[PDB]
Design a protein around this nucleic acid. Sequence first.
RNA 1: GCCAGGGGUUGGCUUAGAAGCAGCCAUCCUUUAAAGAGUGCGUAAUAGCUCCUGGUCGAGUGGCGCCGCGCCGAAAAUGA
Lengths: 134, 147, 187
Amino acid sequence: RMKYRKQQRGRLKGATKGGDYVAFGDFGLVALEPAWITAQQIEAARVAMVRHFRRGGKIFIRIFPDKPYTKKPLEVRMGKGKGNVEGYVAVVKPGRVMFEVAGVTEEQAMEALRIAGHKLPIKTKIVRRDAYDE
Amino acid sequence: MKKVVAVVKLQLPAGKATPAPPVGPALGQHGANIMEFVKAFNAATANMGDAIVPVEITIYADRSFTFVTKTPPASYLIRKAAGLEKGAHKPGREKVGRITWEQVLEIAKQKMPDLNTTDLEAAARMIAGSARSMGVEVVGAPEVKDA
Amino acid sequence: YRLKAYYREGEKPSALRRAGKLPGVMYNRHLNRKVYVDLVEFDKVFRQASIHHVIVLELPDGQSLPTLVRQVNLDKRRRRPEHVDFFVLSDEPVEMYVPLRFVGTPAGVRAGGVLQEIHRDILVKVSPRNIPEFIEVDVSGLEIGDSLHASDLKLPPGVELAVSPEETIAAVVPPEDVEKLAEEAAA
RNA sequence: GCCAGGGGUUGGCUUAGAAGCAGCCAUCCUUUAAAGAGUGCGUAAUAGCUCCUGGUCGAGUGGCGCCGCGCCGAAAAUGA
C-alpha cells in the first residue's frame, strides 16, 4: 500500500454506487446493510471458505479496504488518533458484491458463502447469476 | 441337505497359505479343522496357478466352511500385463501403465464362469471400467461400427 | 422469445412499477418511443434469452419488431430492474454479444484445477439474419496457466468479431486450498 | 404406513485394521419391473438394521424464494 496517512470518518450515505453485479464466478455474496468491513473480517471469511473446500474452487475478494480505521490510546484529546488498530477498511453499501466463488456446485458455493456471512457483521444474501449482464 | 451359519470374505494366494492374519482373527476365534479342510485346498490349487483367490468362505453349521474357489478380483487381471503389485494412488492425473482393450478381452474369459455377466462384450467394459478408477486407460479400433 | 409490448406516455415512472409493469424504451436510427413491459412476463422471457437471443415485441398495432436488449438498468439493493432498452434491427450489419459454450474438460481441471471463464459471451458484428445461439470453443488442451485468446474461435460464416483479436476469452487458473493456508498467514 | 425379497465389488490407494462406510482418487457392467463402485449407525475388521422392488393403499405431495404480523435470543440490585 501507499496512499497517505490517516483519513477522515465520512458518512455511509445511502446505497447509490455501493452496489454491483456479480462479475466473476458462478455464485455471489452481497451486503444488505451499510458498514465498515475490516481487514481481519474479510480474512475471517477468506479462510473459512477455503477451509471448506480444500483443493476446491477459486475465490474472488471484490471489495478492498483502503480506508485507515483510526483509534486513540486509552486517554483523551491531544491530536488525532495514531489509530490503525483494526487497520484499514472498506465502505460497503447495500447491494454491494463482496465474495465471488467458482469451480463449486450449488451445495458447495452455498455452504461456503453463508459461513462467510457469519464472520460478517451485516446481513448477506447469496446470489446466482440470472442473466443480468450489461 | 446341508447347514450353514455366517458369510466371511477373505483374500489370499492359491496353493501357499498359513494361519497368519488377516486369516488369523478369522477362522481362529471360530475354530477350524485344518486337518481335512486343507486337503481340499491342496486338491483345489493342485494344477491351479498362483494369484489372489478370494475363496468365498461361508462357515457351516458344523463348524466347517464352504470352500468355493472363485475367480481373482479385477485388480489382479490389470496388473497381469503391468507386472506391478498394486495400483495408482490417484486414478486421474497420474498414469502407471497404458494397457490395451485387447488384453481385457482374453483375461475376462477367466472372470465369466463365476461372475454374473452373460456375453463378453459386456465383460469387456467391466475389466476396462474397473481399470478406469485405478489409474490405467486403453485404446480401441472396432467399437460401435454402425452406419 | 416473443413478449407483449405496451405503449407508455405521460404515466408517472414509479406508478408503473406499482403495477408490476417495468418501464422501458425501444428505438433506433429511424424511431423513438416510450414503453413498459410486465415484469413477470419480461423475467421469464429474459432469464432464458438475455442479451443474445432476439426478443420480438408485439405492440397494440399488430406490430412485430426485432429488438435487442442494448442495456438494462438494475436497482442496486435487491437485484431488480428499473428500466430496459430495446434496439430495433433491420437487416444491416449490427454489433451485439453472442453466448459461449466450452466443451470437454481441459488438461487443467481434469488433473486438478478450476475453469476460470472470463467471458460468457463475445462481441460480434453481425446481421439480424445471422444470430448464432452459441460459439463452440474446444477448450481441451488448456494446461494450467495457458489460455485461449480471441484469435482462435469457431467463427461461423460471415461473422467477424468486434473486439481485439488479442483479448482473452478465458483462462485456466490454479485451485486455491488449505495447504496454502500454512504458508499464506505465515511469512 | 405396511407385507415380502434385501453379483464381480472385499472399488483402486493408503493403513497394525480401512470388507458400500478414519483419509485420498474417482464417473464400470450384469440378473432385473429394482438395488447408489454408495445415506447413517455399528464391529478391531465384518455381518447386520436402514435411506430396493411388487402388491395392498388410495389422493395428492415434497422442496424453494418473498411479503404482513408475531415467537425464542432477553439476567440487577427499595415495590410493581
